[PDB]
């Protein structure tokens, strides 16, 4: 009972405010009580006491549609017409969620009433598949669903799995079960979604109105077409969507501890508190849920989270203090693995320790998050419903109608009044032809068009191999001005190539893994994980594979090491000790046979961080610490290596004194040295980029370091010094400011950004990041736009910048391949992924991009970038000669008809004719290979574009005013005051002349706004329209010239006289001059910003 206003926990990240409404009766319905209730009845009433009549109900039944169709355009229109507010949780029915700001859009979602345990009715609801319950008891307030997070380590160590089902099918009722199902629309959905789209009921509606013009056989037609091409559309948008399906999760067999035994089960019904099996799988199956390693090592790929390529060891919590309670932000690096993730590989607990070992030698498990919420399932919510889709419906279509139909509703009052002036008209005929007016100034055909120059665009991207799943968004791509790049798989290789080994010559200079000493290879070859397979495959970590490669040795099943190319003798590995992130370090056991004897000689081999083998070393050259830092300067990973030679052990001590001494005077035996290469075609790419006058910005996972340096080597820094932003290690003091080369530390002064982004540039880390945010997130929003590098940004934090980019008016691309843009990508203004080493599955982020490139190249950037443009201008061209269309249109249909002349019905069809073949021609206008560096204007509302449209419509107004009074002048004086109104058109001297002198002027209008030598192809090029063109002036002087009669009489001209005839070419020709002139000569005042 009786909850109040706002029932939402502060600080939750998904739903800013929640309010429950019933939904009302269908006969107690704002749609119907109105309707069915009162204004039908009194004129059924009315009509049963017996043609403006039907009028006056069309008009009220059109009111009714919208409003109807209000409720489904709008979820608050629909809960303010449909449901009303009830404070009593027991007799509410729906709850309309608020999401927090970008999280989505309002919804109505049904509530779920269930039986507890205890007999007590639980309120919960479902929003974007997130359960939200309703704690009655102690809080009063709505809960997202608790996971076992935050909890003390002695309930992990306490569980040992579930000897029952009811417990089960309680757990399953609280928290789900694991659904990675995707629920593809009805087709019946998608199409009553684009069905109760505005533009479809305006056009309905106007053919309802030819229906009405009693265009019977026409009408049908029309609306069977209309109906069709909206059919195949959602037809292709279904197609798109079953590839969504079509990625998925594949249901396997995991083992389940369940009734004191293991158990192999489908990984659908696994519920939070199972202990679960965890291992290498030979399937390549991915983790099915967070979990938490309670048992075993594994050596991870967590490729979806930090975007770094490389495999992370993860340790288990069995070594830890009990007491410890559970940090989600501090303990997920090392101890939690998250669903979807690659297991490279796993170490088997040992046989020594007493407890649960499972069948397939798995890592034992806790299952923290199952489903849709592990970061896995908060990536794919942001996939499937994360913003909305483009349509065809921008604020620019709308305000651009709205201007046009203030004008239409103008020349339709003038109509009106005249037309009311004379008393004689029948009032039927004067609505209809002020109706038929306002409906054909706005023609139907201007979001199909639109829709046509993009399916051209399409086209054109089809055949350079690049997909586009959201067409509506290429214009965009016209005004793109911050392009976001990932760095690992999209300008880097995922490729690791071994430069060699540093420190082993005197200088710098690294030298190649060909020229190193033989202890240095053994070092290298017996210093591994890497272990063979039954099958004879090599699997493991991808740095030990390309170390392994580069040395040439072949590892057996025995754990024995042989070179290939090296006349030296085999190694056999004995002991392993595995590398610990407490120790920093890792070291090997082995054996070689000495050459001569069959004694076999043991030697120690070291790898780890510098800096702790730098305090291992019993003799360390001097520039150690100066080689290591300008290495990791260089953006390069460096381990050390160390070797010793043990001599001889006995076999007893040789596995038991390796306990009691580990890390000792260890020998330095070099750095090796391994890079990731930048991609062959990303630094022309970005050059071209930057050349187009974009700002490129760096967002990456990666370490600062490293990706540094690659933004310097593809020069997204061409300034002296970088600045990395170090967040407070301790509370209280500020962040500094840090040179790479630690030259220079600044403290951050609450100044303008402008300063420090005109000397140095910027990059922010995630850490970094965090802190501003909890911090000042203003000075975050005024920093952002200054940074050129984003580092260790993990995707929420992605999502993060590019919505503060969009905040701030921004139209951005991001670029990526990983599931680490998704976020990112969705967000964008235009994503495009890119497929990581290029030449079916399809990776999420190729189905999470509005664009995806099948090469793994760059160049396609460039292309969208090409083809953005053209589309942006093609578009602004098209509305502006639409406007001067329809303002033309608005004075020949009213005033002309005003002064009673009339376009001949064969006339009129061959001009719509030619005009449909004129925007057909444009439509498909391609744009210009290179790149210019002005930019297209961005916007329909430039000072530019409302000037032009005036200009040329009052230079246009004033010849057909010029005209109409000399053909006036010259037609013969009528002794009537008043024009009839349906004449059968009879061919006079007037409609002939204002007919050619606007056939003229109307081409004239195609002609003088197409521009695009910096932008599209050129006149000459677009050969269709040329012929166009060509046809239309040679059409246009046969009918002025009178050569033929009988021609003319076919086109219905009057043989104009030739006084008469050199005036009207003159002043058409006039015409013609000076709205060529007002155009360029305002292009030449008022472009560009």
Not at 547 to 561: F, G, I, N, P, S
């Amino acid at each position: 009972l009786a909850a109040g206003p706002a029932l939402i926990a502060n600080g939750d990240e998904l739903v800013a405010a929640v309010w429950p409404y019933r939904r009302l009766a269908l006969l107690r319905r704002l749609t119907v009580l109105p309707f069915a209730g009162l204004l039908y009845p009194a004129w059924l009433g009315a009509a049963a006491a017996g043609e403006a009549a039907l009028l006056v109900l069309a008009t009220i039944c059109l009111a009714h549609a919208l409003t109807v169709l209000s409720g489904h355009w709008s979820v608050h229109a629909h809960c303010a017409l449909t449901c009303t507010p009830e404070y009593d949780p027991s007799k509410a029915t729906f709850v309309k969620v608020v999401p927090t700001p970008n999280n989505g859009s309002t919804e109505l979602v049904a509530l779920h009433r269930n039986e507890g345990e205890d007999g007590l009715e639980v309120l919960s609801f479902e929003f974007q598949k997130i359960k939200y319950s309703y704690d009655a008891l102690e809080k009063k307030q709505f809960l997202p669903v608790a996971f076992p997070v935050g909890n003390a380590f002695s309930y992990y160590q306490s569980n040992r799995g579930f000897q029952e089902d009811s417990e089960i099918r309680a757990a399953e009722k609280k928290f789900g079960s694991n659904k990675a199902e995707m629920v593809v629309p009805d087709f019946s959905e998608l199409f009553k979604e684009r069905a109760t789209a505005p533009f479809f009921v305006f056009q309905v509606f106007c053919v309802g109105l030819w229906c009405l013009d009693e265009y019977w056989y026409y009408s049908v037609f029309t609306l069977s077409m209309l109906v069709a091409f909206e059919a195949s559309l959602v037809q292709q948008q279904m197609r798109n969507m079953s590839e969504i399906r079509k990625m998925g999760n594949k249901p396997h067999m995991i083992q389940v501890y369940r009734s004191r035994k293991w158990r192999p089960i489908a990984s659908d019904e696994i519920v939070p508190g199972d202990i679960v099996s965890i291992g290498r799988s030979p399937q390549e199956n991915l983790v099915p849920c967070d979990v938490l390693l309670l048992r075993g090592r594994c050596i991870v790929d967590e490729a979806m989270l930090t975007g770094e390529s490389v495999p992370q060891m993860k340790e288990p919590i069995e070594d830890l203090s009990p007491d410890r309670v559970l940090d989600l932000q501090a303990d997920s690096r090392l101890h939690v693995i998250f669903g979807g993730t690659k297991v490279v590989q796993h170490i088997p607990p040992q046989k020594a320790t007493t407890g649960l070992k499972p069948v397939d030698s798995g890592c034992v498990a806790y299952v923290l998050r199952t489903g849709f919420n592990t970061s896995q399932g908060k990536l794919l919510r942001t996939i499937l419903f994360g913003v909305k889709r483009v349509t065809a419906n921008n604020l620019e279509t709308f305000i651009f109608i709205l201007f046009l139909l203030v004008f239409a509703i103008a020349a339709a009052a003038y109509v009106w009044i005249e037309g009311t002036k004379d008393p004689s008209r029948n009032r039927y005929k004067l609505f209809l032809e002020c109706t038929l007016i306002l409906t054909s100034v706005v023609p139907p055909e201007l979001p199909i068009e639109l829709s046509l120059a993009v399916n051209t665009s399409l086209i054109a991207l089809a055949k350079l191999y690049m997909y586009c799943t959201e067409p509506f968004r290429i214009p965009f791509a016209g005004k793109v001005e911050v392009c976001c790049f990932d760095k690992t798989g999209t300008l880097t290789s995922d490729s690791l190539v071994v430069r060699g080994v540093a420190g082993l010559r005197d200088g710098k200079e690294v030298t190649p893994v060909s020229s190193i000493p033989v202890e240095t290879h053994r070092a290298l070859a017996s210093c591994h994980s890497l272990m063979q397979l039954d099958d004879g495959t090599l699997v493991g970590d991808p740095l030990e594979k390309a170390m392994l490669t580069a040395v040439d040795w072949t590892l057996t099943k025995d754990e024995k090491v042989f070179p290939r190319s090296i006349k030296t003798q085999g190694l056999k590995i004995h002991q392993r000790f595995h590398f610990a992130s407490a120790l920093k370090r890792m070291s090997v056991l082995a054996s070689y046979e000495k050459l001569g004897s069959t004694d076999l000689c043991y030697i120690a081999a070291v790898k780890g961080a510098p800096e702790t083998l730098h305090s291992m070393f019993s003799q360390c050259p001097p520039d150690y610490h100066h080689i290591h830092t300008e290495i990791s300067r260089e953006g390069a990973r460096v381990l050390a290596l160390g070797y010793k030679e043990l001599g001889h052990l006995t076999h007893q001590q040789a596995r038991e004194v390796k306990r009691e001494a580990l890390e000792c005077s260890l020998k330095f035996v070099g750095f090796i040295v391994v890079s990731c290469p930048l991609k062959a075609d990303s630094k022309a790419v970005i050059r071209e980029i930057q050349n187009a006058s974009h700002r490129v910005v760096m967002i990456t996972g990666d370490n600062p370091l490293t990706a540094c340096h690659v933004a310097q080597e593809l020069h997204f820094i061409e300034k002296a010094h970088t600045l990395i932003l170090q967040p407070p290690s301790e509370k209280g003091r500020q962040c500094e400011w840090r040179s790479i080369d630690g030259s220079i530390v600044l403290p951050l002064a609450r100044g303008s950004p402008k300063a420090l982004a005109l000397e140095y540039a910027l990059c922010l880390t995630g850490d970094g990041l965090a802190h501003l945010q909890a911090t000042d997130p203003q000075q975050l929003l005024r920093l952002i736009p200054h940074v050129q590098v984003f580092a260790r940004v993990a995707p929420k934090q992605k999502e993060f910048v590019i919505t503060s980019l969009k905040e701030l008016g921004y139209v951005t691309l991001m670029c990526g391949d990983g599931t680490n843009d998704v976020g990112a990508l969705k967000h964008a203004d235009v994503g495009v992924a890119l497929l990581a080493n290029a030449p079916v599955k399809l990776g999420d982020a190729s189905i999470a991009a509005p664009f995806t490139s099948k090469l793994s190249s760059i160049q396609c950037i460039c292309h969208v970038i090409k083809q953005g443009r053209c589309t942006l201008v093609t578009t602004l061209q098209m509305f502006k000669i639409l406007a001067l269309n329809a303002l033309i249109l608005a004075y020949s249909q009213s005033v002309l008809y005003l002064e009673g002349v009339k376009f001949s019905d064969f006339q009129a069809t061959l001009q719509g004719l030619l005009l449909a073949g004129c925007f057909l021609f444009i439509s498909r206008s391609k744009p210009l290979k290179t790149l210019s560096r002005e930019r297209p204007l961005p916007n329909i509302f430039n000072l530019y574009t409302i000037l032009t449209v005036m200009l040329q419509f009052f230079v246009h107004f004033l010849s057909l005013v010029y005209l109409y009074r000399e053909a006036q002048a010259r037609s013969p004086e009528k002794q009537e005051q008043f024009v009839d109104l349906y004449k059968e058109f009879e061919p006079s001297l007037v409609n002939s002349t204002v007919y050619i002198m606007a056939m003229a002027m109307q081409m004239a209008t195609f002609a003088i706004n197409y521009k695009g030598p910096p932008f599209m192809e050129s006149l000459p090029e677009n050969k269709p329209l040329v012929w166009s063109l060509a046809v239309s002036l040679l059409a246009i002087i046969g009918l002025l010239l009178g050569s033929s009669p009988d021609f003319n009489s076919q086109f219905g001209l009057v043989d104009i006289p030739v006084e008469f005839k050199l005036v009207i070419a003159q002043v058409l020709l006039l015409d013609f001059c000076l709205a060529l002139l007002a155009d360029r000569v305002l292009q030449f005042f008022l472009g560009t910003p």
